[PDB]
Ligand binder design. Structure first.
Ligand code: NA
Lengths: 276, 9, 99
């Protein structure tokens, strides 16, 4: 199907505790494949998926160089934004950035992304045209003018339409046995009496990849969106994910309830019920 | 592959 | 301005007494990123616990997976202890087997 590559940068100041830390991680879909941490004894871009290990030393040296440069540039950027918001030198602050590209099944660019945040709030984003910026406030307007003078949008459009798509296609091929393999969930329904009046039906999905999944409870065929408790999808640690959905049903009415599971790994969507 | 290092904010 | 961590405590595979497994504590939805996470066996901090590299969701909140290999029994209790700037006291969340 469709695929994505995303990089996630976190830069954190910590006054009185050294210079700001810079971390970068890269993902293809829901698979992390590289990391960098400026706090490491010897900071290097490092592999986190087997299929990236085959890249040569020039690859690792170049990505390390970019990340070491970024460590310094984000320290400057944190100093700049502290000034733009008239903030004291005593507080800790965070800049985050996420960027990358989505491609269709034919490998063609669906869209590109580049968004930055300051202390968890939207700060500046590259618009979908890959040519203009949306600045959140008058501080971000300063960054926008700097980036316009540096022709940043033009350079990101070149990256997003070129290298980002080309490297994503290379990774998808080199890791095809995992990145292009959808593992369906293992499913079951459990029954948890609450009282003599009510019980909990919990529909489980385990071992699936990628994380995208739809779990829903129906009562007599009608969706129970407002009444269904959905837990946040969680990583199992072996690349796969887990999720459950729960609904409180009147005792004796359990057969009116069906759990519906949609996932890319499944031959067809599943309908499940409690089987006492 | 990372994007090249860009301009400070 | 700050967001407090959600916490889930669970095993990688279905839990079987005497069979090796992985104990997970997944912390998510928090901001800023500094956070303290320990896994406890009957109240005592487990050593050599590992964790994932810092990343974040579309809404900018951070998430991390802390994990270690373990073998469950019926006597041993497991839990996750989380401290964050949003928390007055550390929060302990027990592993509810097959929650
Ligand atoms: Na605290």
């Amino acid at each position: 199907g469709s695929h994505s590559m995303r990089y996630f940068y976190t830069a954190m100041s910590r006054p009185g505790r050294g210079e700001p830390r810079f971390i970068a991680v890269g993902y293809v879909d829901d698979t992390q494949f590289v990391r960098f941490d400026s706090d490491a004894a010897s900071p290097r871009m490092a592999p986190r998926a087997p299929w990236i290990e085959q890249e040569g030393p020039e690859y690792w040296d170049r990505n390390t160089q970019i990340s070491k440069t970024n460590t310094q540039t984000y320290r400057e950027s944190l100093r700049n934004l502290r000034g733009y918001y008239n903030q004291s030198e005593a507080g800790s602050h965070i800049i985050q950035r996420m960027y990358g590209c989505d491609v269709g099944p034919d490998g063609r660019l669906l869209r590109g992304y580049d968004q930055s945040a300051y202390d968890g709030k939207d700060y500046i984003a590259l618009n979908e045209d890959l040519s203009s910026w949306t600045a959140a406030d008058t501080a971000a307007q300063i960054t926008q003018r700097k980036w316009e003078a540096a022709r940043e949008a033009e350079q990101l459009r070149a990256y997003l339409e070129g290298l980002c798509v080309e490297w994503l296609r290379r990774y998808l091929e080199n890791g095809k046995e995992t990145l292009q393999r959808a593992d369906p969930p293992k499913t079951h329904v459990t029954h948890h009496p609450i009282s003599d009046h009510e019980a909990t039906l919990r529909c489980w999905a385990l071992g699936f990849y990628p994380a995208e999944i739809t779990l829903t409870w129906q009562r007599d065929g009608e969706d129970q969106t407002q009444d269904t408790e959905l837990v946040e999808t969680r990583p199992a640690g072996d690349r796969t994910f887990q999720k459950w959905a729960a609904v409180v049903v009147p005792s004796g009415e359990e057969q009116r309830y069906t759990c519906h599971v949609q996932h890319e790994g499944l031959p067809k969507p599943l309908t499940l019920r409690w089987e006492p | 592959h990372l994007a090249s290092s860009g301009h400070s904010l | 301005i700050q967001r407090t961590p959600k916490i889930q405590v669970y095993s990688r595979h279905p839990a079987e007494n005497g069979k090796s497994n992985f104990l997970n504590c997944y912390v998510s939805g928090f901001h800023p990123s500094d956070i303290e996470v320990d896994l406890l066996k009957n109240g005592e901090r487990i050593e050599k616990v590992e964790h994932s590299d810092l990343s974040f969701s579309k809404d900018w909140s951070f998430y991390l997976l802390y994990y270690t290999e373990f073998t469950p029994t019926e006597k041993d209790e497991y839990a996750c202890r989380v401290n964050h700037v949003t928390l007055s006291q550390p929060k302990i969340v027990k592993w509810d087997r097959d929650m």
